[PDB]
Design a protein around this ligand. Structure first.
Ligand SMILES: N[C@@H](Cc1cccs1)C(=O)O
Ligand SMILES: N[C@@H](Cc1cccs1)C(=O)O
Ligand SMILES: N[C@@H](Cc1cccs1)C(=O)O
Ligand SMILES: N[C@@H](Cc1cccs1)C(=O)O
Ligand SMILES: N[C@@H](Cc1cccs1)C(=O)O
Ligand SMILES: N[C@@H](Cc1cccs1)C(=O)O
Lengths: 284, 284, 284, 284, 284, 284
């Protein structure tokens, strides 16, 4: 029996449930209750505060959790990062009032406000800089105008929040906010390592599969050799006859980021009825 | 022209609309209005109180409805149950205050509170027990603490509601709450039996299809005979060549409940890029 | 870099975002913010008032927009209508109090209230009729009871709003409300015509694809010739062997509106496990 | 320690809590939890389904409840109606399809649908009429169009629901829906009758007080005798000097329904700065 | 029977209903339905689109309405403004991109976007300036960035919307947005002028009363002459004895804007227990 | 110009705004924006995270804030507590799994989870106990079941959260959660101490006033001496004649907690029409 922590609120909550459903796990009946038991797969899901999930995996009885990479950095927990999940990512920056030409060495001896004080203290220490790091609960950008800090450190999305408070980012970026699957650092026994590997393999099937689309298209046999070079697939394109003996249908996986270039090439050699559909799971 | 009753509220409402959409019927424009007309399919949908749907089908002009099995038991209506739909299911139990070792024969001469008094009276009568059944509108669990009843009878989900009021279930379970497609018990004419059968066949396509996934995978020709035995499909696996002449692609339906065992077997004999995707409709 | 206007509210807003996602464009992170930048595809999306989108495309810097056809008629903007999108459609009618036998020539010299005064004035002028057209902001049906107009002109959905105010429609219908992709009437340069055509082709892939389903079914080789005539596909049916040498699997696109007739024919000649699945994109 | 049932939902819920607050009882912290304990006043409040409150008072351990008069009629409970509360009132009528000249004797042998079957059966029996009364859970007006009943019986607010389904009311009105304070029919002991009377007196202070306004106005001593006859107050007007020796200020309770006529009379005899303010509690 | 138009949505809707309730009119049962009938006071209330209310009063059958002053300016309706209501007020300004030193004469021949085109055209014409005024449905501030206009004209609240789009206001302010009670310009008959005056007098009682507070305080008789000069009241302070013969209690209306200065003066001469309470109605 | 921090969310937010409105300060226009400027009173209000308000007052530029007493204890800020506000109060307890007879000395060397780690560490240190205090973001009660802690420390409301997780409180209570007005520990200048004192006096007027009701009643002159002893008021009862020379009206403040006992005594000596009304402000 495995126990998995899922964010119960915020930007990571819906895509975390979506990726667990695509891996075949029982979805949450309604947002009211806070555990979901999966008797088929032998897993229990707990819906917890996002900033706490790393502590529950690192110090508690949870085998796995989904949370942001910056929250793992800030927590001090000793856990394994098994997979980057492909959502929630955003840079983490220092920032200070615009029009002042701020640089990293200006931070020495200043007051820096953040919701991630352990992350920031470790970053400054590696760069050999000492400063006063002030813990806040959230929404730190207003703290400069209000006189609590000289500068801030926060997740920056597209700069809306920095711009709306006349702040500009500077310095090297810190630990980012991409969603990750984390695992407790342990060994336990043999009959537990197997059950753990099964979950990682299933989540990995979604993480990998979601990078591709299936192309299906009708192709003249005369353009077949060209078509095969344009869509070589993960192993090799599938080729099946049509009723019309001068034609075939071809099936091949293609990366989502390549799809529009690929289709233009196929049209130019005679391909017709080019279909593209989402992949939600693929065990390579 | 057919008339179909759909629950307008509660746990059955969204999955009932979802199953009707997957059968190809026009979905509700917005939750405000309470009828949807489908000119293409020649069907009108009425969104009604769930506890009333069995009476509208049994005594009214509706040909079909979707409702819970326990609500059909409680209604006294004479209707046909054509399909179990695969959602909404939960046990229906007697319960009484914890720590008292309650048994079914303890009910004789007691006061029993329930929102389903006809269901409970028929159940007691079959077991040869007489008691005072008190009709309540809902949320019956608090009625013991408040002195209206000695015991209750209700849908139990996972026991959250029983536990939160210090109640424990006992006795044989009663008529459960699984969602069902019900039909009016009739004959009408010939030109009406045909239109009725068409709807049942389409809903059945969803009920059956939703139990499977399509597996698509690349396989070495040397492991082909093993692969065929692992995924025999509904009739027989589809086999198509790849461009690489030492390989094929195989397509076969597999039950959702078997999928993870199946994939492990395929990987161990050489299969690569194992894809799995939802089936939403299949006419066997 | 292209700029595209999307309705931010109302009946057109969700299906407009859905069609842009199926064409492969980055979906809106949350309904709070009002621009979404797509660095991959090199497009910026602006979420604007629906009644204003035609003016932003016609007079502003936007290359494209999605809006209702009646709003383009009312705006006076000079834009190209490139695609009808297949949603949001509804008739646009004159209406007047029930039980009075109203005809178009009764409008001469009357007061007509509408939220689309330019559309109505142009319609009357073409028919050679003069009247006083009163601009209102919305919900015009109550304006007769309240004495501001003798008749109205409005989008009629199914007549709920007309019926609920005792109004009946008359006369030839006006410019309807179907959703359309509009483009700025221009030429600009060469490197801009190409980027524009790419977007139209991708949206067209969704508009075309969404009219079909993929049928997949197992078929005896003895019924193969009949099967090919029943599902001829967009080019020609795909045919692949099963493991069982007396059988094949057939794949063919079929129009959604034909699907249930088609499947009945296939069952009657021996076809088994008839699958149907949505198409979300097809470049013909 | 007293126990009081308050509707947890619907049209009676907010004004019931408002009247209990004005009587000085602790208000509900938030709509989530379902009991509120008042240690000061020694009362516990339970927030229950409105249709069940009469059964909890009549058969359970609750001393008091607030509910509709029609729900008491339908419940069959033996409880005392102590106060009419002055809100929630509406007529209860039979109704049948418009344009048919329906009368009470037309009900004999017909099918009548209602959410209050015990109320309706008792009403028919008193009039010497037999019919088939069909219990429905709610929203009964659509049941005629759908073929379950020939006529209905329901609370009619202003006829919106009857009109929107082409129904017209007929016959003598039944038990109405005015909110009432009900009490368990009992005697218990001496130390319980006292605590019960205290609550009734406090609620009665609100019910009585809310029928009046306090008038405060400056008046010339020459118009004093006229003023006293216009506002005689509950006992006699209060009269106090102003600094200016030719003037006084007068205070008197006046019924809300009389206030505007009263003020016009006072202005016409010289009164100035006529103030009116709500009364929320008055023990006569 | 009078008919009154109330905004059904937006910033004016709640304070408009609040002022009508304090004048003693029946409040809206729930936001669903769109008329409220007051049989006691013989008035019917219609809840309409705010931008349309001036047209319903000016051209329709409504006797009164509550709307913004700028909406009356933009409508072209001929109505009487009877009372300024004391809420909703905000300036109406031209604005253009920051850092450009814009002045009113820069508008000549430019494109100006606004939701109030008739208001703006009349303002420009009075100043002897010609320009192209572009009607938009709302949210006009983004129209400069998007290339539809050179400048805008809009209600400015505190400049949040101008600042968030890098716009700065210039020129003389236009017709503002303060809420007003408007009346149809007419004469009708005698028995209608009376009913109209009654409503204006009652609303005026709230508009006037809401500018004051009632002060009630205990005062030594030795400081009485000073106290009378500090709070002279609307006519003259009320003076009543306390039980203690060296003391009195004084009651006087004071303007809300003066209250804190007044109380400081009273404390310094010996006044104790200084009470202040809201006035909701006063007929002077 | 003063700056005041108000909680923007949670249980303290609405009563904090209510108490500031009753002191005469401008209320927040809508929950969207996060500052409100009061030009009349010369105060700016900032709506901030509750757990941060003590840091903004202690280290920032804010003169005042409203927050919980436990949050001041946990923050380490050096601020003055000027007033207890009379809402939000609740005990703060240690707790551990039920049925184990837990005592304070059992905490030594254990793991204790809390959202208020500084408060808990200082409490343990004063009692001479060492333990491992684990910071969590919220909802700490589940942390025992999940293996992160042996015991917890949290605000307990009525024990719902402890009971729902099978925890029981033990030991002496810690710093509680009552709402307080806090002030920055400073001196600044002379012209700033005055403006600060004015705000404290106005909030104190609400805190004091809200503990009383005004009684107004008609009394026979023969029962006057008894009446004066029953309601002596804050200074002495107000006495005014009625028109009827055998009667007077009496006005006196009485504590809310005494009111029902007082009224019973007044009725028994002949008092009639006993009115009671809320006090929202009183400067003693
Ligand atoms: N044969 C193609 C498509 C696939 C069929 C089955 C799995 S992948 C490929 O390898 O990409
Ligand atoms: N031939 C495979 C897969 C299918 C293709 C078409 C329908 S089912 C089977 O029977 O399971
Ligand atoms: N060959 C079939 C099905 C398709 C396969 C690939 C594209 S369309 C057809 O043309 O309809
Ligand atoms: N004396 C007046 C007003 C009141 C003063 C106190 C109670 S009622 C009356 O009897 O109406
Ligand atoms: N006599 C005082 C207070 C009032 C008593 C009644 C009306 S106004 C004044 O004129 O202000
Ligand atoms: N004179 C009474 C009532 C009051 C009148 C004015 C202030 S307090 C008292 O001191 O309680």
């Amino acid at each position: 029996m495995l126990r998995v922590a899922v964010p119960n609120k915020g930007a990571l909550s819906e895509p975390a449930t979506e990726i667990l459903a695509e891996a075949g796990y029982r979805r949450r009946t309604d947002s009211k209750d806070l555990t979901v038991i999966d008797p088929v797969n032998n897993v229990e899901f707990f819906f917890l505060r996002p900033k706490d999930i790393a502590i529950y995996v690192g110090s508690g009885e949870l085998d796995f959790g989904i949370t942001g990479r910056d929250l793992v950095c800030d927590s001090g927990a000793q856990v394994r990062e098994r997979l980057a999940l492909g959502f929630g990512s955003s840079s983490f920056r220092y920032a200070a009032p615009a029009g002042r030409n701020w640089t990293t060495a200006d931070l020495a001896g200043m007051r820096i406000a953040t919701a991630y004080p352990n992350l920031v203290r470790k970053d400054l220490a590696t760069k050999g800089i000492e400063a006063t790091v002030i813990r806040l609960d959230g929404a730190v950008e207003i703290s400069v105008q209000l006189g609590v800090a000289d500068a801030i450190a926060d997740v920056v999305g597209s700069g809306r929040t920095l711009s709306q408070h006349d702040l500009v980012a500077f310095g090297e970026p810190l630990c980012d906010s991409e969603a990750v699957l984390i695992e407790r650092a342990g060994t336990d026994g043999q009959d537990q390592t197997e059950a753990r590997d099964q979950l990682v393999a299933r989540v990995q099937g979604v993480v990998f599969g979601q990078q591709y689309l299936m192309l299906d298209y009708d192709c003249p046999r005369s353009a077949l050799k060209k078509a095969t070079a344009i869509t070589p697939g993960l192993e090799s394109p599938t080729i099946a006859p049509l009723a019309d003996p001068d034609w075939v249908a071809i099936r091949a996986l293609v990366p989502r980021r390549d799809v529009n270039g690929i289709m233009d090439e196929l049209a130019a050699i005679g391909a017709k009825a080019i279909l593209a559909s989402d992949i939600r799971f693929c065990r390579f």
